[PDB]
């Protein structure tokens, strides 16, 4: 219980980040999950004990809060709803990632050749689409907007970069911050430009980060790894991160290179290229960098 009613739980996931924090929220009769892991036997498994070890059944969570459309924490949100829950999501999501998982072929051509023009050589998309369960009918959530769930208040925090409906949920009189994947304390979370992603994805996320830093909040819980104590502290720290990244990318541009080769050193797979892509148009847009092409090769001016 990190709150009287507020709970950690951490769920497996078929992915490097091999563990996703989900947050149970109980009172006043109500019953809430913040994210909601994916589909598969281990996963669901998992969600089950803890549910169990509370006394209730997936049957019983009837509010779902998403932080985000990524499988890790999306993935189970329309069998919740299935069962009755209301799903809520922010509003950007809607045409973007959430897109994405109910209309597999409005991005998928882009998809691919934005990996292609970029440079990739000759799926696990599919292996995750199958483990991902899309609401039919979420609701959207706006920025600032004031949620009572479970007896407790939730200010909804757009914060868009690492996705672009990507909002954490704050609790203000306590000052616990609900971050999603904003912010996590061992690593950076992934600053990806897909084909459905907002122009300048980067710079969403460093702004996202002051907003972050400046909010006062005496403690972060995020999607993945332990608590964040000195959320401003983390913050800065993620800033000065990217901005070390970004000036390791100046000097992998030694002359003229993709995006897919660029990712290799960028990151000593997916991911790695869509960050990448991420910071070189973040530094196009600056100016710094220009390209030829499609086949696209970017260089340093
Ligand atoms: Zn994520
Ligand atoms: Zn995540």
Redesign the pocket.
Known sequence: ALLPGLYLLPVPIPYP?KT?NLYLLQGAGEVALVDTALGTRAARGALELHLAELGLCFQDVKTILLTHH?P??YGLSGFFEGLGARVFLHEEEFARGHRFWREPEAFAEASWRLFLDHGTPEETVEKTRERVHPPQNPLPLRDGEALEVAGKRLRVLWTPGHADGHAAFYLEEEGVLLAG?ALLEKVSPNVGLWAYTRENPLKDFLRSLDRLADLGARVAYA??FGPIADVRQRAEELKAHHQARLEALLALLDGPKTAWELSLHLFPRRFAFAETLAHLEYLREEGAVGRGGPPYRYFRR
């Open positions: 980040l996703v990524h890790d924490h994947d999607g993945h």
